[PDB]
Write an enzyme that holds these catalytic residues in place. Structure first.
Site, PDB file in Angstrom:
ATOM      1  N   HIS A 161      49.903  83.555  89.128  1.00  9.83           N
ATOM      2  CA  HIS A 161      50.894  84.613  88.992  1.00  9.83           C
ATOM      3  C   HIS A 161      51.905  84.348  87.866  1.00  9.83           C
ATOM      4  O   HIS A 161      52.949  84.991  87.775  1.00  9.83           O
ATOM      5  CB  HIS A 161      51.557  84.895  90.357  1.00  9.83           C
ATOM      6  CG  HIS A 161      50.592  85.385  91.399  1.00  9.83           C
ATOM      7  ND1 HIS A 161      50.921  85.483  92.731  1.00  9.83           N
ATOM      8  CD2 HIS A 161      49.305  85.796  91.300  1.00  9.83           C
ATOM      9  CE1 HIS A 161      49.885  85.945  93.408  1.00  9.83           C
ATOM     10  NE2 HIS A 161      48.897  86.159  92.559  1.00  9.83           N
ATOM     11  N   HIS A 193      39.226  84.955  93.267  1.00  5.96           N
ATOM     12  CA  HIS A 193      38.684  85.703  94.410  1.00  5.96           C
ATOM     13  C   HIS A 193      37.257  85.280  94.779  1.00  5.96           C
ATOM     14  O   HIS A 193      36.917  85.334  95.955  1.00  5.96           O
ATOM     15  CB  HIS A 193      38.793  87.229  94.226  1.00  5.96           C
ATOM     16  CG  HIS A 193      40.175  87.774  94.481  1.00  5.96           C
ATOM     17  ND1 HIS A 193      40.437  88.847  95.312  1.00  5.96           N
ATOM     18  CD2 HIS A 193      41.375  87.369  94.015  1.00  5.96           C
ATOM     19  CE1 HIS A 193      41.740  89.070  95.346  1.00  5.96           C
ATOM     20  NE2 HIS A 193      42.331  88.194  94.561  1.00  5.96           N
TER      21      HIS A 193
HETATM   22  C1  HEM Z   1      48.678  84.255  99.033  1.00  8.76           C
HETATM   23  C2  HEM Z   1      48.220  84.108  97.798  1.00  8.76           C
HETATM   24  C3  HEM Z   1      47.994  85.200  96.833  1.00  8.76           C
HETATM   25  C4  HEM Z   1      48.039  86.544  97.077  1.00  8.76           C
HETATM   26  C5  HEM Z   1      48.277  87.205  98.405  1.00  8.76           C
HETATM   27  C6  HEM Z   1      47.778  87.208  95.848  1.00  8.76           C
HETATM   28  C7  HEM Z   1      47.757  88.603  95.711  1.00  8.76           C
HETATM   29  C8  HEM Z   1      47.708  89.234  94.486  1.00  8.76           C
HETATM   30  C9  HEM Z   1      47.852  90.625  94.284  1.00  8.76           C
HETATM   31  C10 HEM Z   1      48.019  91.671  95.353  1.00  8.76           C
HETATM   32  C11 HEM Z   1      47.782  90.838  92.943  1.00  8.76           C
HETATM   33  C12 HEM Z   1      47.822  92.152  92.248  1.00  8.76           C
HETATM   34  C13 HEM Z   1      46.432  92.596  91.882  1.00  8.76           C
HETATM   35  C14 HEM Z   1      46.404  94.053  91.565  1.00  8.76           C
HETATM   36  O1  HEM Z   1      47.024  94.839  92.312  1.00  8.76           O
HETATM   37  O2  HEM Z   1      45.737  94.466  90.576  1.00  8.76           O
HETATM   38  C15 HEM Z   1      47.641  89.595  92.300  1.00  8.76           C
HETATM   39  C16 HEM Z   1      47.522  89.405  90.953  1.00  8.76           C
HETATM   40  C17 HEM Z   1      47.031  88.233  90.438  1.00  8.76           C
HETATM   41  N1  HEM Z   1      46.782  87.093  91.094  1.00  8.76           N
HETATM   42 FE1  HEM Z   1      47.181  86.723  92.907  1.00  8.76          FE
HETATM   43  N2  HEM Z   1      47.596  86.299  94.889  1.00  8.76           N
HETATM   44  C18 HEM Z   1      47.719  85.063  95.378  1.00  8.76           C
HETATM   45  C19 HEM Z   1      47.564  83.847  94.739  1.00  8.76           C
HETATM   46  C20 HEM Z   1      47.009  83.695  93.477  1.00  8.76           C
HETATM   47  C21 HEM Z   1      46.405  82.513  92.988  1.00  8.76           C
HETATM   48  C22 HEM Z   1      46.340  81.183  93.707  1.00  8.76           C
HETATM   49  C23 HEM Z   1      45.878  82.827  91.732  1.00  8.76           C
HETATM   50  C24 HEM Z   1      45.204  81.901  90.799  1.00  8.76           C
HETATM   51  C25 HEM Z   1      45.154  80.592  90.971  1.00  8.76           C
HETATM   52  C26 HEM Z   1      46.173  84.202  91.478  1.00  8.76           C
HETATM   53  C27 HEM Z   1      45.860  84.909  90.358  1.00  8.76           C
HETATM   54  C28 HEM Z   1      46.236  86.246  90.185  1.00  8.76           C
HETATM   55  C29 HEM Z   1      46.125  86.905  88.871  1.00  8.76           C
HETATM   56  C30 HEM Z   1      45.561  86.311  87.607  1.00  8.76           C
HETATM   57  C31 HEM Z   1      46.590  88.152  89.032  1.00  8.76           C
HETATM   58  C32 HEM Z   1      46.669  89.207  87.965  1.00  8.76           C
HETATM   59  C33 HEM Z   1      45.374  89.970  87.826  1.00  8.76           C
HETATM   60  C34 HEM Z   1      45.414  90.897  86.625  1.00  8.76           C
HETATM   61  O3  HEM Z   1      46.238  90.710  85.694  1.00  8.76           O
HETATM   62  O4  HEM Z   1      44.639  91.890  86.551  1.00  8.76           O
HETATM   63  N3  HEM Z   1      46.833  84.697  92.560  1.00  8.76           N
HETATM   64  N4  HEM Z   1      47.553  88.625  93.266  1.00  8.76           N
END
Ligand code: HEM
Ligand code: HEM
Ligand SMILES: [K+]
Ligand SMILES: [K+]
Lengths: 711, 711
Positions: free
Chosen positions: B249, B85
């Site tokens: 993810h 982010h």
């Molecule tokens: C269109 C692209 C993406 C969208 C819209 C998106 C959106 C989200 C959302 C809504 C969550 C849930 C967070 C929550 O509600 O606590 C999430 C989790 C996560 N995303 Fe993404 N994400 C995207 C791409 C990526 C990318 C490219 C990465 C890393 C390279 C990433 C890493 C993460 C991680 C690590 C979590 C888990 C966070 C946790 O465990 O607390 N995401 N993402």
């Protein structure tokens, strides 16, 4: 604007109206300033061909230009207004405003409703500003030009000090009101009214009062009360109010030759092709005999380009009748009179005399009445007093005589000055200093006090009008001796110890002496070495002041409602305690890092008035460390309010819930606000200790010298 | 807020929404900065216990804090999300945004709807930040915590590189849209719409796209369009795009245990007691198993805390059906699947395979589709693809290698770094410079050409991401040779002259050699003296680039719409011509005084593309004077528009009325703007003649050295 480019878009002020901003700790930076790094204005001004310049303005006075022609072939009437307006926004309340920074050039003051046509006035001077280069600032010249206009119409002046440096940014720290509509006033108020502090105006976009009268209603005794309060806010009394308004409107003419709807957009909304000129008039020519400025069509005297006693004489010569201007405004006419006042463009033609409700307030007001009469009885006491009030007006925000420069500086010490005599004895060297620190600590006064009474003395400075500080040591004088935030009891003990230390060092000893001023501050530096283990700088040369030169009603404005540095006071409805704190740091010219270092240290050292446990986040108070910031930023602590008002808090342990700390919003904002928290972190780190300590001593010594213009 | 005190009340941005502001040239000054004047971060980072810090961060991964508990006993995914982010705002369109200035900790990125709970994640890193003092900055610390997180969970990163200094103010030169309501998008847009430049996100307050789908509509192929463009605006292609979503993810989960009405106010409007922690949650325990961030309750893989293939295998093992989360948001569950994934807190409970609309978009899209299979059929390629695109993500807004410090900097050159090989030869000494200045003028190329081209080389820089400039001489490589603003006819003639001169000298010499880039910059200095009679500085050591290393696609984004410096282009409906000039000035890191001095000088040296005489306010052009300013501020001139659109204007004799000059809004803003008029006045005085010349030469060299990080 929300234009898809850099600089456009919604900003933080859009999303978070209530949020605190530290903008005002980032103003007037070198980056915005064109002049050479080593350029000094005072030195430049002293080398100005000042006589040459005065002659050139008098040349300009009659040099009617065809794009903005001269009423009666003389621009003096135009240029006395420009300068009245430059200075006339000053307000004693917070000490902001005035002519001292040439802000009339800039928005919003360039495009105010009371500032119509002054853009042209200002433009008529460019050919001179271009000749005299850097040696004359806009700040100075705009006021000096007002003085040359009087001299050239046969009015003698009391004097003129220069030395106001020019600014390059619009000054964002001045509260002109919350209205959001020009001429508006429906908030600065809540007859029988109470204009809110710090305001010194009845409308937004206007200098003092309304000429048509309150809310535009021609009730002169209701308009009198407006003028007594607003001029009161600007430091003026009744005698000086009468001398100003009479002497002012003894020259000139107003311009409402038509319906205002014919006027265009002000300089800041004007088209780009008009080059900083707004108020494009479509009524006939637009300039000269057709000029449209305020909407009232008045001329007060038989000789608008020459000094005389026309204004007062005529006011006490007819009975006055309310009429209306050619643009539709509430003005007064003379119940009877061959045209004595002359037209601005027809030499032959003349008209009946007329006036302004405000002017008419001077006759209908009980008090003014009289003054108005003593001036007719003494057309001298009134020549004097006008010049005296005129000089006061233009130099009320400059500060101590030490800051005044120029061939025409006056030698008479004036009552409103806050004069301090220059030191007339030998100043203390290093050995005397060392010897005095020891003697001060040897008295047995608690170091915490010395530190408290050092800061209280220095903290009075407000760098806007430049009044206050450790110099003169007025802390011993009224009203500061009994201010609740100074802790009168401890204030007097420390002062009693310093009184003896002095008589001891000045007594019979030959040559040198020391002011109580130097000892008050040096007591602080003595105490602070002992507590920090570091060398603390100290500059001697302060002198003591007398009460005579301490206008007790003037100084009552400087008393703070809230003081974060000393843990005093609480917020109000419209202002949170943190909002005062930045307002105070802006006034002490402190940066955000400077501010942060100062609070962290003053706390550990207990400089809290009355002496409470607020923010004393150390288990070893009285010893300068970064314990305040470490403890504040601690993630294992939590904060609950200890009052529904939300002014005091309590820090507690997250796991065990045991109580640890008390604190005030002056303390928690350094955790809460993002940008201030970013500075707390630097001082809270393990490497931050010794760096914080030096910074505290830098920032401490800076505060201590804010009023040392004698250097 | 408009409260009776310093800081409050109505402002110039309230009165004049449309008015140009120069704030973005008064930023990141050193008055806001707490560090010593002698502090150099790169020097401090070099001495950091980098490995020791790294150990402490792995130790932080499994060290759950009871005030914000660790899902599955591991803060890893939280931290990855943090790092994605911070980096995630970056857009190639202008270069603004990204991880590079630690801007997540400041409003508004700290209070964004897409950054809920990243305050807690940030806060969890404060003990470590405190222990490494300033040797580790926030900007870097946020990004490095992402790398260590991955490395801790069995994933081999490509590399990592620090050197990011910290900022101390909220950056206000970024346009994140015009909407005034969080998640708003009506304005940006105007299944088949166009997202306006330069934005790279579908909603105000989100990083790239809507997790629920286009306007909360769970339509996978519509979401894929959204993802393609938003990631293309942030420099990633489909092969990289799919690797990033599938890598992230593959770790952790999402949070939405309850309705979103249970979450309170973001930090910048949170209560003071919370100390910059926002999003207070009344649901249950408000943290841990009752955490609510987005409001989606998904958990992608069977091993949320270990690298492996789960993400794509699961996406390609089941078939999906739309359902809703406990907060009522659109997600996807598999049909007929047994409870395989694990609960974050209960180790005896399991749930069904869940996915997101955006993640479904990867399998549904026929382009993304194949890549996913390619990664399914080849697991060590997918890893590779991800660690590279992860590295790219963290270092896109950093600049050229020269900028890249630390023990984990890769030796391999990447296709997008814009690499210039180091100088491996002897650079030219003063004798050679003199000699070469003569041989350049001896070609008989008009000085105008040397000044146009030299500047067109330097002008291409941008501090947003630090791309462009005169190093490499990419003005000769595509796309900058075919750029209309660079007048390709004259760019060729100059470049042909310098090539023969380079040859000469070059081989002619022994041991030493000179680059085409230096002969371009050196052409201008040799031409600028002749025009000024002064000494113009010169710093050799530039080298040349090859088409290989010039990312054309990325470089297209640097083409201007309007160049106020060269007299190119016209405004827009939403953006005036001058507003671009200020955007470009900021991007060139110029102060307002530097800006003013630069136009004046460029006009008088006829530096206008094509050769138009717009704003060339001199009767003796090709010679450096302050004739631009003298002739722009002259009170005896006036202007009118002479174009079908009010871009160009005509200066005329206010008296005689005959025509004098032609101009443009780029030139007439230094007569319109109060603040910019004040700077032009300094250079238009009689004693600003030789002062202007200097400041032009100081700033011309300043601009010719913006990209010289080899120092
Ligand atoms: C269109 C692209 C993406 C969208 C819209 C998106 C959106 C989200 C959302 C809504 C969550 C849930 C967070 C929550 O509600 O606590 C999430 C989790 C996560 N995303 Fe993404 N994400 C995207 C791409 C990526 C990318 C490219 C990465 C890393 C390279 C990433 C890493 C993460 C991680 C690590 C979590 C888990 C966070 C946790 O465990 O607390 N995401 N993402
Ligand atoms: C409450 C007090 C006062 C009010 C409301 C007021 C208001 C006005 C107004 C509306 C005008 C007409 C200007 C125009 O529209 O063109 C005017 C003229 C003028 N006033 Fe005042 N005034 C006040 C006091 C003073 C004072 C104290 C001075 C000088 C010390 C002064 C100097 C002038 C001059 C020189 C003009 C002539 C303007 C010109 O010829 O261009 N006034 N005043
Ligand atoms: K002032
Ligand atoms: K950046």
């Amino acid at each position: 604007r929300k234009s898809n480019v850099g600089g456009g878009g919604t900003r933080n002020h859009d999303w978070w109206p209530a949020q605190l901003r530290l903008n005002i700790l980032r103003q007037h930076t070198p980056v915005s300033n064109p002049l050479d790094k080593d350029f000094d204005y005072a030195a430049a001004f002293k080398s100005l061909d000042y006589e040459g310049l005065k002659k050139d303005l008098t040349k300009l006075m009659t040099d009617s230009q065809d794009w903005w022609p001269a009423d009666f072939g003389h621009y003096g009437g135009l240029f006395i207004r420009m300068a009245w307006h430059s200075a006339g926004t000053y307000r004693v309340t917070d000490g902001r405003g005035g002519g001292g920074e040439g802000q009339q050039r800039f928005a919003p003051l360039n495009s105010w409703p009371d500032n119509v046509s002054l853009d042209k006035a200002r433009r008529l001077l460019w050919p001179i500003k271009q000749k005299y280069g850097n040696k004359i600032s806009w700040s100075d010249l705009l006021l000096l030009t007002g003085n040359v206009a009087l001299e050239s119409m046969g009015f003698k002046t009391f004097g003129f000090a220069g030395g106001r440096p020019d600014t390059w940014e619009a000054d964002e720290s001045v509260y002109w009101g919350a209205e959001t509509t020009w001429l508006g006033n429906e908030d600065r108020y809540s007859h029988n009214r109470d204009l809110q502090s710090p305001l010194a105006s009845s409308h937004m976009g206007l200098i003092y009062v309304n000429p048509e009268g309150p809310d535009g209603i021609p009730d002169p005794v209701a308009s009198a009360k407006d003028i007594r309060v607003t001029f009161g806010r600007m430091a003026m009394n009744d005698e000086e109010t009468v001398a100003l308004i009479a002497g002012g409107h003894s020259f000139g003419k107003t311009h409402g030759a038509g319906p205002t709807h014919h006027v265009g957009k002000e300089p800041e909304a004007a088209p780009i092709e008009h080059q900083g000129l707004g108020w494009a008039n479509s009524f006939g020519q637009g300039k000269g005999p057709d000029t449209i400025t305020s909407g009232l069509e008045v001329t007060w005297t038989p000789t608008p380009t020459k000094w005389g006693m026309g204004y007062l004489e005529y006011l006490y010569k007819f009975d006055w009748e309310p009429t209306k201007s050619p643009a539709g405004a509430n003005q007064w006419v003379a119940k009877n009179a061959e045209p004595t006042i002359p037209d601005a463009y027809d030499p032959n033609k003349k008209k009946l005399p007329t006036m302004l409700t405000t002017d008419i307030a001077l006759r209908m007001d009980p008090a003014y009445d009289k003054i108005c009469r003593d001036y007719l009885a003494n057309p001298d006491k009134f020549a004097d007093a006008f010049a005296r009030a005129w000089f006061k007006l233009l130099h009320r925000d400059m500060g101590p005589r030490t800051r005044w420069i120029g061939p025409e500086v006056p030698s008479e010490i004036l009552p409103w000055e806050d004069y301090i005599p220059p030191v007339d004895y030998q100043i203390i060297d290093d050995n005397d200093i060392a010897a005095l620190k020891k003697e001060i600590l040897a008295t047995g006064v608690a170091p915490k006090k010395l530190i408290f009474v050092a800061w209280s003395s220095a903290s009075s400075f407000r760098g806007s009008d430049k009044r206050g500080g450790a110099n003169g040591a007025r802390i011993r004088l009224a009203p500061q001796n009994e201010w609740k935030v100074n802790d009168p009891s401890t204030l007097r003990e420390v002062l009693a110890a310093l009184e003896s230390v002095q008589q001891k060092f000045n007594d019979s000893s030959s040559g040198k002496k020391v002011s109580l001023a130097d000892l008050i501050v040096l007591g602080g530096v003595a105490a602070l070495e002992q507590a920090s283990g570091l060398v603390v700088p100290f500059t001697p040369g302060r002198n003591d002041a007398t009460q005579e030169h301490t206008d007790v009603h003037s100084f009552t404005h400087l008393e703070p409602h809230a003081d974060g540095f000393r843990s005093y006071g609480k917020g109000t409805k419209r202002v949170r305690t943190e909002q005062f704190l930045i307002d105070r740091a802006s006034l002490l010219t402190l940066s955000a890092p400077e501010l942060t270092a100062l609070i962290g240290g003053l706390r550990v050292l207990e400089a809290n008035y009355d002496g409470s446990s607020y923010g004393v986040l150390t288990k070893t108070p009285g010893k300068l460390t970064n314990d305040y910031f470490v403890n504040l930023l601690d993630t294992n602590t939590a904060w609950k309010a200890a009052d529904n008002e939300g002014e005091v808090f309590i820090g507690y342990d997250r796991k065990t819930h045991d109580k640890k700390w008390t604190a005030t919003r002056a303390d928690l904002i350094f955790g809460a606000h993002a940008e201030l928290r970013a500075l707390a972190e630097v001082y809270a780190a393990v490497d931050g200790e010794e760096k914080f300590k030096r910074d505290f001593v830098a920032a401490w010594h800076k505060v201590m010298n804010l009023d040392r213009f004698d250097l």
